[PDB]
Amino acid sequence: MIVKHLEEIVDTKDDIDTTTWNSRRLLLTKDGMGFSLNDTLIKAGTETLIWYKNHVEAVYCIEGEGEIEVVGGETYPITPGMMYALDGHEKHYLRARSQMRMVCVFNPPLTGAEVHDEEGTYPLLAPITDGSAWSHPQ
Ligand SMILES: CC(=O)NCC[C@H](N)C(=O)O
Ligand SMILES: [Fe+3]
Numbered sequence: 001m002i003v004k005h006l007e008e009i010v011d012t013k014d015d016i017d018t019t020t021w022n023s024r025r026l027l028l029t030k031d032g033m034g035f036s037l038n039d040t041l042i043k044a045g046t047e048t049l050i051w052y053k054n055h056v057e058a059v060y061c062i063e064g065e066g067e068i069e070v071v072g073g074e075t076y077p078i079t080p081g082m083m084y085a086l087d088g089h090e091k092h093y094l095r096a097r098s099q100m101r102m103v104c105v106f107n108p109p110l111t112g113a114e115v116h117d118e119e120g121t122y123p124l125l126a127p128i129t130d131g132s133a134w135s136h137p138q
């Protein structure tokens with residue numbers, strides 16, 4: 001038996017924050033289920049190029065709006081209830097108009113190394129600046 005809660009995972013080592021996405025990992029390779037499972041926020045205004053050569057991924061949008069553009073294929077708007085699955089290891093752009101909340105399943109599971117390494121993802125456009133600078137401790 002495994003029991004977890006998103007509200008425990010947030011702001012913890014299983015919450016991986018990147019320039020375009022915050023992935024809250026629910027089932028890890030360690031959990032032995034044969035897949036990994038996460039709840040990922042795709043930040044508003046962002047664009048990320050994605051290509052998982054070594055995994056298939058299912059993505060189910062439960063909040064927000066954006067689009068996925070398949071390189072050499074079509075562009076599919078993303079809204080709550082939209083599901084896509086990359087059974088052909090498709091290279092794709094993932095764009096968020098508003099913040100998107102995505103339940104994601106990977107077939108072999110992703111490892112912690114792969115998530116930290118951002119393997120298979122290339123962030124291209126980050127959220128608009130909030131006015132902060134690294135050199136402003138205030
Ligand atoms: C929604 C999406 O595709 N996020 C990509 C990150 C992925 N969930 C991962 O953990 O590598
Ligand atoms: Fe994806």
